[PDB]
Design a protein around this nucleic acid. Structure first.
Ligand SMILES: [Mg+2]
Ligand SMILES: [Zn+2]
Ligand SMILES: [Zn+2]
Ligand SMILES: [Zn+2]
Lengths: 115, 67, 477, 528, 98, 34, 44, 98, 257
RNA sequence: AAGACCAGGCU
């Protein structure tokens, strides 16, 4: 009787912003990203890509509660670089890697099928 | 009641293998050989056919309560 | 004793006792004496021989049975106070054969030591590897395990009937379950159980469940509620009638919807019925009319399954209605193994978040390892290993209590032949990050039972409701 | 009669004046939630929808109360009733009544219970005043009450079909009382024994020990995750213990960030020997087995039940006494969250290989059992030939039983010690017993080596039949096997007679548990 | 009506003398599971009052071997007072000593 | 003549014969019939 | 009203105040056909 | 006609006695159902075996506070015909009398 | 400072199964790919069911539950179909649903097995996969089952019936060189089918400089989608999710700026 | 309505 519907895992309603950006006052050049209606699939990807950036000092994510569908990402970068720029660059690099992987997987499928 | 459509653990379809399993077991395959013949490799799909109880046959003995 | 064994003029139910020291001989033909069968031992040899076993193995189409076995003087019924004069041997092959002798005057031998257990305790695999309080807990909890209680349940009109979608016979079985007919009406499901501390939601006695498995029909069930209602004539002109009331004609009227009733004031089967819905419209002519219609139990949210109209003892119209609802297992619901390990469902994770083996197998149930060390239910672990062996072998394991032909080393040696670590451990990968788990987690199939107790039947809240008549205090219940 | 109306329990005085049924109360099953704070409780929406709190309209909250009244009883957060200055009650649940939805200062709006509300939470056997503590409401899906696991030991609750009661105070004054008096962080230390009541329990304690060992080296991403799960973290990454080959942090180095303020404490691990304090290496313990926390930093040592548990002078107790209730709450929550999330990496389990011992250990155990049985046979033979001399103040039967019990207890203790010595460092039974999370050295001994003697009414198994215990034994048999000594272990399995004797042994415990409760409760009531 | 009432209500005796009549006999058959039905059909009850704090009649006696299940009893005030029958146990029906 | 350590088959055969003849509720039925 | 019989499965035409005995066979048990109005299920 | 006696299901006087699987299925009766219960007003009622002390046998016990050091008794019944449940006691008065 | 350059080898490719190896990529990449294999791949499954007559011994939602678990050939039109929540119409149409009809009656004496072959669809591309046959229900003589069913588009997050896959095997570092797992006794553990070491040695020597680097895969299809196209759809879906975050995150940066 | 008995659950 209290079961939530099947779609709160994957779907926004009126008023929910997919991403919310809040600055962190504890440490300079630190930001906090809130991603609504996402899970580990995307947070782990983004954190792993961000840890490769030499100008990123901190990168981590968590699910505040498993029964809720929400991701929080904290990014701290060096002084002459914005964590927003770090986030955009990580996303672009991930997309670029995935496109190349897709093309090479298609080439491998075609080579496997016609011998 | 009746064989489940999917294995609960992995999701392989075992709903179309009950009759073939029964036929092989009647044709003198043992349970282990029959499961291998049907193509059920890992223990999660094997337990489905190995531990199934077909009560739907018992339920079909009773006359329907309508025409 | 010769005449009793020949059944000549002394019935086998008569017990005879000689107390040598007090010089008394007592014979009881009285009713109510409890007794059990035993094999007769003459000298050091059983009277049961290979021809008896051959005839009993050819029992079909030979009209040779346990009564013919009794009539041959092979087995004997012995009650409690005759056992005082009996020298019993636990097994023939062990205690009859010559050793550095304890005794040589054995007079009887047990059929099998596992016959000392009851009906509910005979379903426990490896009961001699568990603690006795846990065996008692399992004996009590087995009566609450849900399943198919009787095959003709679709005919029966019973209140509070629970039936399970996909019962399975246990992969690890006791030799005595065949005589309890547990194969024909199973009360549980074999499930892949991993004993690990995953996310802290299975701590204490809780369980993590696989939501993807639950979506495939895992431990899904149906609950049937039956409703009785009676037409009667009590007053001279005061009578009860099944009819569909009009909106403001009767005195009693609730804002509930009467639109679902038929011409005779009975909901037809197949109609979805929720809270406050009127299943039976019964009006009592007020000497205009009083509404004694019956409602559903609050939030039952079911569907009318069967409607029956008859005549009772007196001859008035009588009606039974059966409502069903499906209940999919939730967080608050109670689950238990065959070893006394009971627990609610702490949380449900989809298949993506569950830990997985190299083969893609994910556990259906995850239980905390902390339930094992203090409760000392080793039979659970041995069952888990034996079921893993059996699912690969294609056979059904034998867990009869006191058999020396099964031990943990032999089960491990058998399991090692199928490409698995011989103690049941297996390398698991984290579901969230994909990294390996440093420890190797004990996994395997174990028989689990869903219990009658569910959170939907226990949750309750109150704010300024009904008031007791005499104390002007809140109601009970 | 009237005497019967007033006299007994459920009579007027005791059943309707000293205790009575109340409104605004809820009951349901409790399930764990390690993501809640120690003062928070998870509440289902249906219960929170039914339960209401009357709130007075002021110029500060009039807009919010009007929004709640517009939402009404259909949508989850709104009002159920509106109460006028004259006491007339307006119901919003049946009809929209748009003329009556007007609000002014002085009205009372009965809103639905929201996040942040204060509730008393209770478990029924109700033995001391920590059985009822005030919690802070957090609203969660599904239909079970959820609470932190350190709070389980105050209530004596486990998550096995257990239900707990929820009381919601209905006035601001009583809300203030519960907040200021009975909140969970204010009840950490009991006045009964001046000890902390809540402690680190279950997965978290074993993970504490395994995390705080010397061998734990944490990589950069793992450190960032664990710091992401810290609520009191200042945001500065500490310099790793190891720098150049690769940057490597240590478990103690991250545990020092969990430890609040500047706390000074010295404890000892469970496996601490007494030899280290005498000779050298007093301050450089080779086994890592002394605990030193200086200036709020863990310098050396392995934590266990003796450091994070509920005992006098524990780290949690010292933290409470130095820092107060508000900081100790965050200390419990941070320990829980960060160490569960680290245990996600290493994992913990139990299995058959944890209960199987070495082949040489099995031979040693069998030799010890055979020697003990031969000694009991020799003692029986000494009594049979009347060579046994009776001990002062004791009967011949009493001294015979004392000697046999001494022999069997020595045998069981020696076998248990051998089994405990045979355990490896990776054994999960040892990992659970040493940390004090659950289980014990006698449980390990009974699992691996020998279940031991079975006793009924504090005596060895009696003669229910004429001069014997079972029809399988001969009359006048005082040997260990006949009188209930279980030679086998749980792993090996019990013989039929030993199984029956163990059932007899457990029946006594069940009976005692069922019987003692009435007398204990009657004593408690009379004392109160 | 005497047979019908004493089998329906469970009070074993005259309805007017119900105070002296023994109660608890003839419960409603348990249909939750087949094992539950079998255990209910094979069950024994000690007439000793449930309120008695005396432990002695509740303990597992040696003479229950092979006759009464050692594992199966309810938990609560009726520990050891409600006993189930062993699988091979048979209760004598009685005969005349002529 | 003697069963030579075929005993596990033999004892369960005789148990099967017993339960095939009597069943589980004979104490109810025998008592009522008598 | 249309009532299926409990032993012989013949439907009866019947009305209020008619005592229940089946026209074909005299049996006293009747069942009400599942209604005509439709109910929607999710296949979850 | 003097009355109606309820019938235990599947007994020698039940209508299900000696029927086969096909007959039981035609009767909408489960073959696996053991019987051994009654049907009273539509409900299923099961008589629970009642334990009791044996009759016609001499027993000797010792009470703590009683005037008697030893108390022998014999709960006697006339073959369960005309049964009065008559009990004689034969007791030995305690020597501790001052 | 930059993206991977991964490579793919494919070893086995059948109608049921795809074994492929992904080299030179992150562990998080591989885990998210195998996770998207289960939960983010769209497929067609029966979701709305209306039953007209059901005189079988299984109840209405029992039969409806079985119907939803029957796989449907999703190979072609799952890219063409809309989600129902995105469709422009008020009620079921060919751009957002597929209609199925079942009508079986048992007139003959011998028992009839109602199988997935008895399901009839309005369009030829989306037959049930099994066309042995998946058994829905058995009918005695005189029993009847008539119903209508509409199939929609969803993915594994919603319900396990929308899982396109029959278990994904995933493995990396078959010889335990990174020591991500610690064997108390290495000699007791069977070797992986991808192990590259001799019969005599148990584990590879410890590699302090290594990082997880080859991911071994084995995607087994349930029949709705070919195992070759399951991976492509998963990759495209993950890329689309990342592109949707890039898009909406660019707007949130512009809102702060 | 109310009263009675019984069964089960958590300590
Ligand atoms: Mg509990
Ligand atoms: Zn499977
Ligand atoms: Zn008819
Ligand atoms: Zn459309």
């Amino acid at each position: 009787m209290n079961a939530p519907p099947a779609f709160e895992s994957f779907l926004l309603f009126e008023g929910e912003k997919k991403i919310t950006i809040n600055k962190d006052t504890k440490v300079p050049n630190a930001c906090l990203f809130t991603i609504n209606k996402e899970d580990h699939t995307l947070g782990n990807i983004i954190k792993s890509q961000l840890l490769k950036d030499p100008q990123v000092l901190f990168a981590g994510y968590k699910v505040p509660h498993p029964l809720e569908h929400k991701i929080i990402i904290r990014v701290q970068t060096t002084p002459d670089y914005s964590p927003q720029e770090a986030f955009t660059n990580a996303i672009t690099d991930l997309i670029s890697e995935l496109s190349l992987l897709e093309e090479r997987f298609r080439v491998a499928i075609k080579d496997k099928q016609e011998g | 009641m009746i064989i489940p459509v999917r294995c609960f653990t992995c999701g392989k379809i075992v709903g179309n293998k009950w009759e073939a399993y029964l036929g092989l077991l009647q044709a003198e395959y043992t349970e282990g050989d029959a499961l291998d013949a049907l193509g059920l490799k890992r223990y999660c799909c094997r337990r489905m056919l190995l531990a199934h109880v077909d009560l739907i046959e018992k339920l079909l003995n009773y006359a329907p309560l309508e025409k | 004793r010769k005449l009793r064994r020949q059944m000549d003029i002394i019935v086998s139910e008569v017990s005879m006792i000689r107390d040598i020291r007090e010089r008394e001989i007592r014979i009881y033909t009285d009713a109510g004496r409890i007794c059990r069968p035993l094999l007769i031992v003459e000298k050091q040899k059983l009277l049961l021989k290979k021809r008896h076993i051959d005839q009993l193995k050819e029992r079909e189409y030979n009209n040779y049975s346990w009564q013919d076995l009794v009539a041959s003087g092979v087995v004997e019924y012995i009650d409690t106070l005759e056992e005082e004069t009996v020298m019993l041997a636990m097994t023939p092959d062990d205690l009859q054969e010559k050793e550095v002798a304890y005794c040589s005057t054995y007079t009887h031998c047990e059929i099998h030591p596992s016959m000392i257990l009851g009906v509910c305790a005979s379903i426990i695999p490896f009961p001699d590897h568990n603690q006795s309080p846990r065996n008692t807990y399992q004996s009590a909890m087995g009566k609450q395990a849900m399943g198919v209680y009787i095959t003709n349940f679709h005919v029966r009109m019973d209140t509070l009937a629970h039936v399970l979608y996909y019962p399975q016979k246990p992969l690890v079985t006791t030799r005595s379950m065949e005589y309890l007919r547990f194969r024909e009406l199973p009360a549980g499901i074999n499930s892949i159980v991993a004993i690990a501390s995953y996310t802290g939601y299975n701590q204490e006695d809780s369980v993590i469940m696989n939501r993807s498995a639950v979506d495939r029909g895992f431990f899904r069930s149906v609950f049937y509620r039956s409703y009785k209602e009676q037409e009667s004539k009590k007053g001279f002109d005061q009578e009860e009638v099944f009819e569909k009331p009009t909106r403001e004609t009767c005195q009693g009227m609730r804002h509930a919807i009467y639109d679902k009733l038929d011409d005779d004031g009975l909901i037809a089967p197949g109609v979805r019925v929720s809270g406050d819905d009127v299943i039976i419209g019964k009006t009592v002519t007020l000497p205009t009319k009083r509404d004694c219609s019956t409602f559903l139990r609050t939030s039952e949210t079911g569907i009318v399954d069967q409607v029956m109209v008859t005549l009772n003892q007196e001859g008035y119209k009588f009606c039974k209605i059966r409502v069903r609802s499906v209940r999919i297992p939730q967080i608050g619901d109670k689950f238990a193994s065959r070893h006394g390990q009971k627990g609610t469902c702490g949380i449900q994770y989809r298949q993506e978040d569950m830990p997985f083996t190299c083969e893609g197998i994910t556990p259906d149930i995850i239980i905390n390892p902390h339930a094992i060390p203090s409760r000392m239910t080793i039979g659970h672990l041995i069952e888990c290993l034996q079921g893993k062996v059996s699912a690969n072998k294609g056979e059904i394991g034998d867990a009869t209590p006191f058999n020396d032909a099964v031990n943990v080393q032999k089960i491990s040696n058998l399991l090692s032949d199928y490409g698995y670590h011989l103690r049941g451990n297996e390398v698991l990968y984290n579901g969230f990050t994909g990294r390996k788990i440093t420890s190797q987690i004990f996994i395997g199939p174990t028989y689990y039972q869903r219990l009658k107790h569910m959170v939907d039947d226990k949750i309750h809240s109150r704010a300024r409701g009904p008031i007791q008549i005499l104390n002007r205090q809140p109601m009970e219940g | 009669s009237l005497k019967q109306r007033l006299k007994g329990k459920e009579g007027r005085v005791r059943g309707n004046l000293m205790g009575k049924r109340v409104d605004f109360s809820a009951r349901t099953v409790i399930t764990p939630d390690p993501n809640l704070s120690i003062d928070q409780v998870g509440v289902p929406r249906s219960i929170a929808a039914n339960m209401t709190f009357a709130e007075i309209v002021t110029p500060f909250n009039i807009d919010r109360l009007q929004e709640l009244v517009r939402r009404g009883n259909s949508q989850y957060p709104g009002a159920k009733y509106i109460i006028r200055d004259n006491g007339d009650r307006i119901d919003l649940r049946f009809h929209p009544k748009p003329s009556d939805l007007h609000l002014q200062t002085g009205y009372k709006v009965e809103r639905h219970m929201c996040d942040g509300d204060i509730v008393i939470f209770n478990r029924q056997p109700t033995l001391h005043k920590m059985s009822m503590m005030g919690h802070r409401v957090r609203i969660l899906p599904w239909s079970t009450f959820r609470l932190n696991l350190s709070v389980t030991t105050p209530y004596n609750a486990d998550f096995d079909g257990d239900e707990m009661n929820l009381h919601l105070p209905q006035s601001l004054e009583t809300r203030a009382e519960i907040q200021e008096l009975a909140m969970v962080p204010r009840m950490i230390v009991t006045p009964q024994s001046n000890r902390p009541v809540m402690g680190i329990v279950q997965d978290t304690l074993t993970a504490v020990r395994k995390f705080t060992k010397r061998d734990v080296f944490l990589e950069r991403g793992e450190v960032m995750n664990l710091l992401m799960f810290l609520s009191t973290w200042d945001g500065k990454v500490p310099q790793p213990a190891i720098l150049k080959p690769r940057p490597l942090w240590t478990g103690k180095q991250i545990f020092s960030l969990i430890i609040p303020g500047h706390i000074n404490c010295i404890r000892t691990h469970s496996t601490h020997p007494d030899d280290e304090d005498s000779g050298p290496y007093k301050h450089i313990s080779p086994g890592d087995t002394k605990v030193v926390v200086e200036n709020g930093e863990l310098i050396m040592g392995i934590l266990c039940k003796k450091s994070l548990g509920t005992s006098a002078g524990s780290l949690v107790h010292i933290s409470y006494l130095e820092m107060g209730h508000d900081i100790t709450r965050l200390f419990y929550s941070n320990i829980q969250t960060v160490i569960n999330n680290w245990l996600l990496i290493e994992g913990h389990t139990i299995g058959i290989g944890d209960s199987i011992a070495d082949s040489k250990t099995y031979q040693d155990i069998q030799n010890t059992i055979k020697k003990a049985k031969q000694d009991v046979i020799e003692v029986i033979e000494k009594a049979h030939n009347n060579e046994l001399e009776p001990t002062p103040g004791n009967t011949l039967r009493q001294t015979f039983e004392n000697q046999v019990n001494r022999i069997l207890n020595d045998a069981r203790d020696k076998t248990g010690s051998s089994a405990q010595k045979s355990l490896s460092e990776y054994n999960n039974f040892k990992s659970m017993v040493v940390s004090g999370a659950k289980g014990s050295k006698i449980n390990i001994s009974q699992v691996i080596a020998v279940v031991g003697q079975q006793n009924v009414e504090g005596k060895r198994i009696p003669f229910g039949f004429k001069h014997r215990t079972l029809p399988h034994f001969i009359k006048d048999d005082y040997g260990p096997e006949s009188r209930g000594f279980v030679e086998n272990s749980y792993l090996a399995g019990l013989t039929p007679t030993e199984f029956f004797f163990h059932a007899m042994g457990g029946r006594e415990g069940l009976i005692d548990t069922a019987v003692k409760t009435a007398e204990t409760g009657y004593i408690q009531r009379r004392l109160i | 009506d005497g047979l019908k009432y004493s089998l329906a209500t469970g009070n074993w005796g005259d309805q007017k003398k119900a105070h002296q009549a023994r109660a608890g006999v003839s419960q409603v058959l348990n249909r939750l599971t087949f094992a539950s039905t079998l255990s209910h059909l094979r069950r024994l009850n000690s007439p000793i009052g449930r309120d008695g704090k005396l432990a002695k009649p509740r303990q597992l006696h040696n003479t229950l071997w092979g006759m009464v299940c050692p594992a199966e009893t309810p938990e609560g005030h009726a520990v050891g007072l409600v006993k189930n029958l062993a699988l091979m146990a048979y209760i004598s029906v009685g005969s005349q000593p002529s | 003549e003697i069963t030579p350590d075929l005993w596990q088959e033999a004892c369960w055969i005789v148990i099967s014969s017993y339960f095939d003849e009597k069943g589980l509720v004979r104490q109810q039925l025998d008592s009522f019939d008598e | 009203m249309i009532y299926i019989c409990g032993e012989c499965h013949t439907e009866n035409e019947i009305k209020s105040r008619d005592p229940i005995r089946c026209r074909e066979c005299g049996y006293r048990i009747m069942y009400k056909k599942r209604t005509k109005r439709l109910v929607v299920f999710d296949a979850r | 006609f003097i009355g109606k006696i309820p019938i235990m299901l599947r007994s020698t006087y039940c209508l299900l006695n000696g029927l086969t699987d096909r007959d039981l299925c035609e009767l909408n009766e489960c073959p696996l159902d053991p019987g051994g219960y009654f049907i009273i007003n539509g409900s299923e009622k099961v008589l629970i075996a009642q334990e009791k002390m044996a009759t016609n046998t001499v027993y000797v016990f010792a009470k703590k506070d009683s005037k008697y050091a030893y108390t022998g008794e014999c709960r006697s019944c006339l073959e369960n015909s005309s049964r009065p449940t008559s009990t004689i006691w034969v007791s030995m008065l305690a020597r501790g009398g001052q | 400072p930059y993206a991977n350059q991964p490579t793919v080898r494919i070893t086995e490719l059948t109608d049921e199964n795809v074994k492929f190896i992904i080299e030179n990529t992150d562990l998080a990449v591989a885990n998210s790919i195998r996770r998207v294999f289960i939960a983010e791949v769209p497929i067609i499954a029966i979701d709305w069911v209306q039953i007209d007559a059901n005189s079988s011994v299984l109840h209405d939602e029992f039969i409806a539950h079985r119907l939803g678990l029957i796989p449907l050939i999703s190979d072609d039109i799952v890219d063409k179909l809309q989600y129902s929540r995105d469709c422009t119409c008020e009620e079921f149409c060919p751009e957002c649903s597929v209609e199925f009809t079942l009508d079986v009656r048992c007139n003959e004496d011998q028992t009839r097995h109602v199988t997935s072959r008895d399901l009839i669809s309005n369009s030829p591309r989306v037959i049930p996969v099994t066309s042995d046959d998946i058994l829905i229900v058995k009918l005695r003589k005189g029993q009847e089952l008539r119903l209508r069913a509409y199939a929609k588009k969803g993915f594994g997050k919603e319900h396990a019936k929308w899982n396109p896959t029959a278990g994904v095997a995933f493995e990396y570092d078959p010889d335990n060189a990174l020591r991500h797992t610690v064997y108390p006794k290495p000699e007791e553990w069977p070797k992986s089918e991808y192990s590259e070491l001799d019969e005599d040695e148990s584990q590879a020597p410890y590699d302090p400089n290594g990082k997880p680097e080859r991911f071994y895969y084995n995607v087994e299809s349930c029949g709705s989608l070919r195992p070759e196209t399951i991976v492509l759809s998963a990759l495209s879906g993950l890329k689309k999710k990342l592109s949707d975050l890039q898009t909406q995150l660019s707007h949130e940066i512009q809102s702060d700026v």
